[PDB]
């Protein structure tokens, strides 16, 4: 994810959507979910992925 | 027998030592530009549906 490595001509979304479509998923990164409460396939297909979360040092236990 | 002022100098020479410029080649980088991130060949799907 180095800055300034992907231009307007070579886009990042194009690159990673091709990567995804090469794995059987869809270009735009949306997979369609079901509702865990009603059990029905939601009408909109959701955008899901893997992101890196940090946990901050500020906790309600200290404030 | 003493020292007296003589005629004013007619000119001055100032010497300095200087080397010269080479040709402009402008060789910017060993491996140049920002080389683009790219597709691994073939890849293949690493996942299948159930059924």
From Swiss-Prot, chain A:
Compartments reported by the entry: Nucleus, Nucleolus; Chromosome
Disease link: Treacher Collins syndrome 4: A form of Treacher Collins syndrome, a disorder of craniofacial development. Treacher Collins syndrome is characterized by a combination of bilateral downward slanting of the palpebral fissures, colobomas of the lower eyelids with a paucity of eyelashes medial to the defect, hypoplasia of the facial bones, cleft palate, malformation of the external ears, atresia of the external auditory canals, and bilateral conductive hearing loss. TCS4 inheritance pattern is autosomal dominant.
Family the UniProt entry places it in: Belongs to the RNA polymerase beta chain family.
Primary role: Catalytic core component of RNA polymerase I (Pol I), a DNA-dependent RNA polymerase which synthesizes ribosomal RNA precursors using the four ribonucleoside triphosphates as substrates. Transcribes 47S pre-rRNAs from multicopy rRNA gene clusters, giving rise to 5.8S, 18S and 28S ribosomal RNAs. Pol I-mediated transcription cycle proceeds through transcription initiation, transcription elongation and transcription termination stages.
Domain notes: The active site comprises the fork loops, the loops and the rudder that stabilize the transcription bubble and assist polymerase translocation.
Subunit text: Component of the RNA polymerase I (Pol I) complex consisting of 13 subunits: a ten-subunit catalytic core composed of POLR1A/RPA1, POLR1B/RPA2, POLR1C/RPAC1, POLR1D/RPAC2, POLR1H/RPA12, POLR2E/RPABC1, POLR2F/RPABC2, POLR2H/RPABC3, POLR2K/RPABC4 and POLR2L/RPABC5; a mobile stalk subunit POLR1F/RPA43 protruding from the core and additional subunits homologous to general transcription factors POLR1E/RPA49 and POLR1G/RPA34. Part of Pol I pre-initiation complex (PIC), in which Pol I core assembles with RRN3 and promoter-bound UTBF and SL1/TIF-IB complex.
The protein, known as: DNA-directed RNA polymerase I subunit RPA2
Covered residues, full protein: 947 to 1009 of 1135
UniProtKB/Swiss-Prot annotation, chain B:
Subcellular location(s) of the protein: Nucleus, Nucleolus; Chromosome
Region ranges (Disordered): 18-41
Biased composition (Pro residues): 29-41
Residues modified as Phosphoserine: 26, 34
Family (UniProt): Belongs to the eukaryotic RPA34 RNA polymerase subunit family.
Subunit structure: Component of the RNA polymerase I (Pol I) complex consisting of 13 subunits: a ten-subunit catalytic core composed of POLR1A/RPA1, POLR1B/RPA2, POLR1C/RPAC1, POLR1D/RPAC2, POLR1H/RPA12, POLR2E/RPABC1, POLR2F/RPABC2, POLR2H/RPABC3, POLR2K/RPABC4 and POLR2L/RPABC5; a mobile stalk subunit POLR1F/RPA43 protruding from the core and additional subunits homologous to general transcription factors POLR1E/RPA49 and POLR1G/RPA34. Forms a heterodimer with POLR1E/RPA49. Part of Pol I pre-initiation complex (PIC), in which Pol I core assembles with RRN3 and promoter-bound UTBF and SL1/TIF-IB complex.
Note: It is in an antisense orientation to and overlaps the gene of the DNA repair enzyme ERCC1. This gene overlap is conserved in mouse, suggesting an important biological function.
Known function: Component of RNA polymerase I (Pol I), a DNA-dependent RNA polymerase which synthesizes ribosomal RNA precursors using the four ribonucleoside triphosphates as substrates. Involved in UBTF-activated transcription, presumably at a step following PIC formation.
Protein name: DNA-directed RNA polymerase I subunit RPA34
Part of the whole protein covered: 103 to 153 of 510
């Amino acid at each position: 994810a180095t800055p300034f490595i992907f231009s307007e001509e070579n886009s990042a979304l194009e690159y990673f959507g091709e990567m995804l479509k090469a794995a059987g998923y869809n270009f735009y990164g949306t997979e369609r979910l079901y509702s865990g409460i009603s059990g029905l396939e939601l009408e909109a297909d959701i955008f899901i992925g893997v992101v890196y979360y940090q946990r901050l040092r500020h906790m309600v236990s200290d404030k | 027998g003493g020292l007296t002022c003589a005629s004013a100098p007619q000119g001055t020479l100032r010497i300095l030592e200087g080397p010269q410029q080479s040709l402009s080649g402008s060789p910017l980088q060993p491996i140049p530009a920002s080389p683009p991130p790219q597709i691994p060949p073939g890849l293949r799907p690493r996942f299948c549906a159930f059924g």
